[PDB]
Design a binder for this molecule. Structure first.
Ligand SMILES: CC(C)[C@H](Nc1ncnc2[nH]c(-c3ccnc(OCCN(C)C)c3)cc12)c1ccc2c(c1)S(=O)(=O)CCC2
Length: 169
């Protein structure tokens, strides 16, 4: 079956959320698009990007280095479409701002706007974790910006509960 997402909670007509590891979701669902929480040089050294790359047995990193050689780095707020490998048909590498490294939080709207070029996506919560954005703010920007169908996988039950409670206020 195609895009067989299971156990998500529907927040709006186009945003769904689950307490799950995005890697495990991608292996099970094999969505049309999986979003990577990338950096501008597509160096998948840890966190979500390192976990997605390891699940491809480093094929994503080799492909990413070849893309950077020919095209140069992305911009913060920008994206590129590369292979999904064994995880999806495509991987949309999206650069959210890293607030802990001084980048502008307003670029989070530009980052989520990349999602609107794809009908259905499996994605992480952009700029959360060690990128330093307030995760409740990142969910509000996602809900206000994305118009296509997005399935958010958040791998932390404590944060999942805080995000759902924050949305349902
Ligand atoms: C907020 C947090 C809960 C969330 N984390 C995650 N959200 C969704 N899916 C996730 N998988 C993993 C993961 C990390 C290590 N190893 C893994 O797999 C190893 C076991 N397998 C072999 C069974 C999976 C983490 C993760 C998240 C959201 C956005 C960002 C980050 C973190 S960040 O990486 O800190 C910076 C970039 C933006």
């Amino acid at each position: 079956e195609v895009n067989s997402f299971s156990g998500y909670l529907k927040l709006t007509d186009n945003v769904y959320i689950k307490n799950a590891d995005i890697v495990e979701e991608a292996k099970k669902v094999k969505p049309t698009v999986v979003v990577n929480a990338a950096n501008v040089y597509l160096k998948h050294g840890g966190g979500v990007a390192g976990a997605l790359n390891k699940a491809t047995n480093n094929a994503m990193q080799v492909e990413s280095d070849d893309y950077i050689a020919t095209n140069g780095p992305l911009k913060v707020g920008g994206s590129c479409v590369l292979s999904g490998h064994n995880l999806a048909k495509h991987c949309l590498h999206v650069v959210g701002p890293n607030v802990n490294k001084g980048e502008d939080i307003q670029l989070l709207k530009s980052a989520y706007e990349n999602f609107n070029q794809h009908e259905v996506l499996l994605a992480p919560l952009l700029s959360a974790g060690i990128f330093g954005a307030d995760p409740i703010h990142s969910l509000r920007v996602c809900v206000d910006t994305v118009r296509t169908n997005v399935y958010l996988a958040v791998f932390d039950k404590n944060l999942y509960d805080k995000l759902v409670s924050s949305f349902l206020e």
